[model samples]
Target chain A: GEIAALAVNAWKTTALKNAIAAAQKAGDAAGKIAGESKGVETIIGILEQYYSIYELKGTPLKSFFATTHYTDISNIATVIDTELNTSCGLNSLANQAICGLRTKLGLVAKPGQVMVTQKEAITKMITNVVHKSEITAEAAKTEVAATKTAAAIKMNTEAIEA
Target chain B: DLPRPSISAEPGTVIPLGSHVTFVCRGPVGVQTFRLERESRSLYSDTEDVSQTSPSESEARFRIDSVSEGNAGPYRCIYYKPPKWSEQSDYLELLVKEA
Candidate 1:
């Protein structure tokens, strides 16, 4: 629920002008530093999820992509909308990855916290390991790997959330 | 093997920092201690807080009550076999904030 809500929120919160600004900055910076646009975009993506308010704006990943079927977990919804854009769900992964990078940068604390209903379930996974690690790049890698796979997220959620 | 662990939660949305939070673990019961430490703490993974809970091959739950910002996120669970702990079971992250 929270995960879906958050996933939905992320898509809903994208400010078009802010995105355009980052694009411009990335573009302007790109002109000065050859081959730096991609890196800028990457970093900006992280900022958008973390310190996005400074210059970059927020853009929910759902806006750009269609929804995918997350069937492993029972989705409790009073209503259902099958109108999701098929080609867009992949962006949720990318948006989640952006959140991942932001957390690794120490700019954002619990990146996964960004998820709504998924938060409780997600936290349950690491319920034992609290204040254990600084939440490093490896942690980010592991998270990215987990989010990419259902078994990882589901098992982890089942461990703690239920 | 089975699926690795996963931690999930949002940042800036939790109870006061430096408090206890409950964690439940579910899996094979082993002589393992669930250690909760922020992944950023590189000082020593061995120096993690150790505790015991029901590890019913199917599941177990670990809870950390009253969690603060420091206790915020990037968590994982590991089954301590002995002098050494198994590699972390993936990781669970929660962005803790004021309750």
Candidate 2:
């Protein structure tokens, strides 16, 4: 099992990179909703803390390596899980974002549990979660636009009648 | 204990990136499943019975397409029959180079 031990050690760094990527995407989605909700801003703050902890300043370079421990990865998963089942979970947008983060963390925590052939399935699940959040944000924006258009029509009709 | 399996890579182990490689896992005649492991982590498990052609051997072929840098690693294989699992084969290193 020397190979397994070394694999686990190498995977620690890869897992953190994956986690940081998911966290950043979720944080961006949370930012989109933060303008209308204070709770989402709190969610954004929490994600920011993780970004700081992971030293993820901008887009991560492929060659970059972070000295990550198993405990660090486990704690991130715990925090995401807690937020998903509690406060952040209640907000639809925040819940979707956090869920996406959690899905990505699944591979990080137990790489051996999922067969390599099924890695694509995990990726598809994460993509669906992120896509759902984007759709919700887009729908909200469209609804606001429709309301403004309706208000404009009403104002123009009153002016014409006057 | 189940009979130990052996694993080998086709066309040698040193592979250039972007090519295809298939890992062959061979075990005893009655093996029901063959699992490919990389660095101790289970990568894929095949249950297809391919022992019809060979009376003494059962085997599974794991084909990885568009090989990348990440695929370069030490790999091993094991076979299972019902409730027992065979010992893992010796490690075979797949070295990847710039293509």
Candidate 3:
């Protein structure tokens, strides 16, 4: 739910922008319904979620592309809108935003590469070894692990924001 | 035939000069040998033999004697079964900072 809320917030501004444009064609309700989720909770979550100032600036991947940049996460939200939303509803869009973020980020080390499948993937590999090596105190290991997770979360938020 | 091992680093990914650094690669229950590689213009690999310290984890520790600017780069690892090697684990960056 936090991720979905984040996914939504990442584009709340764009959603409102699109809604304003759409309202000119249809009724204000269309715009309201489309952009309604762009609210305080979503806005606040974003303040807490982003690690980089850059992350706080750009539109959400789905909104930037799906609504504005001429549509694209693999073209994620559109594909979800075209295919899944007919059956699964708005919830599926949130779900796919998460999936889309993962897939997009997963490419930081694409499959053809020799070393990794994901950027964070490498961090994970060594961290596990670091833990078992027992070279550092248990507290240090936990800190590394915690930082890795936080970094991963930051990467996720950054991707969606970018 | 061995499950893939995952890699990690300690003292954080970005280490300061003279700080001790540890890179860990952990695999499934029975893995015997773990190899680590750092990526740059060329590849640097090292081997460490490790055993399972816990019921579900088998791991090896690759300790960098002293982290320097040369050590800051991306690193990856894999487990070995003689003639065969498991898929390379994900990568980790060892960033060394100036004192």
Candidate 4:
């Protein structure tokens, strides 16, 4: 009876260790995504201000505002961060889309107040908005995979705890 | 010269995927039709009557049952008078986030 009890305790101990490792792995993934999301939010803010200036000039970045007008991009980033930090988060399509947008935004040089002539600056900004929507949509797909992995590990941890 | 029409979205422009959105276009009276377009492509058209409150203004409502990523972009509307179509209204963008 003593030996059987010892074996049972050992099994539980192993299970507990594996659970801890799984949780740690999940926490790392959440942290990484959170960091990336923060970086994306910063870029979004910069773009928002850049476009706001154009809007005031009467040559607005129509497509960018169309997407951002009603809903603040920063708020979207906040929700994704919140969901990831909590238990069993649903993979957010918005986060993935924003991530993809970040990639496209990276390709264009950020607008400067006086780095180029007004005509050249407007042209560059127009180019930034005019590129095909498919660029962001296609890139949006890749980040969803990483988010799903993190969500799945979190689910596994929950099951183990229960 | 025909006056330009105005366009707007119900519940604002930004929405979640798989949700519903309605575009409202208002224009001068005697409008033969109101057409909603995205990226210059006609998506829907209507010929609703003039409003009761304002006899001078006519309007149309275009509703999308389920919005998708493809729906995320700029939109505008134009109205047809007896002579010709009015200039397209300024663009109103629709953004669809994940649910």
lDDT of 4 by residue, B7-59 (tens): 88988899888888888888887876666666624123344444533877788
Which candidate gets the maximum lDDT versus the true structure?
Answer: 4
iRMSD of prediction 3: 17.3
User: What fraction of correct interface contacts does each candidate retain?
Assistant: 0.00, 0.00, 0.00, 0.00
Task: Using TM-score, give the best candidate's number.
Answer: 2
List where candidate 4 sits over 4 angstroms from the true fold. Answer: A1-162, B40-53
Interface RMSD of each: 16.1, 13.0, 17.3, 15.8
The local distance difference test score of each candidate is 0.35, 0.51, 0.48, 0.53
Candidate 2: segments with Cα more than 4 A from true spot = A1-162, B40-45
Sorted on lDDT, best first, the list reads 4, 2, 3, 1
Model 2 chain B weakest lDDT span, ten residues long = B40-49
A best-first ranking of the candidates according to their TM-score comes to 2, 4, 3, 1
Candidate 1's residue-wise lDDT over A1-162, tens digit each?
Answer: 989988655654454334444444544443333322232333335335443421211234233212321111122111010111111111111122222322332322121322122234323322222222212323444444444443433444344332
Residue-level lDDT of model 2, residues A41-141, one tens digit each, is 33233344443222122222111112221123333344433443342221111223333433334422231232222334434543443344344545654
In candidate 4, which residue pairs get closer than 3 Å at backbone N, Cα or C atoms, i.e. clash?
A: none
Give each prediction's DockQ, rounded to 2 decimals: 0.02, 0.02, 0.02, 0.02
Q: Compared with the real two-chain complex, what DockQ does model 2 have?
A: 0.02
Residues A30-135, candidate 3: write the lDDT tens digits.
Answer: 3333333332223223323431111111344335333432211233234322332222121111222222232323422222333332325423432443333232
- Fnat for model 4 comes to 0.00
Task: Name the runs in model 1 displaced over 4 angstroms.
Answer: A1-162, B1-13, B16-20, B42-63, B82-84
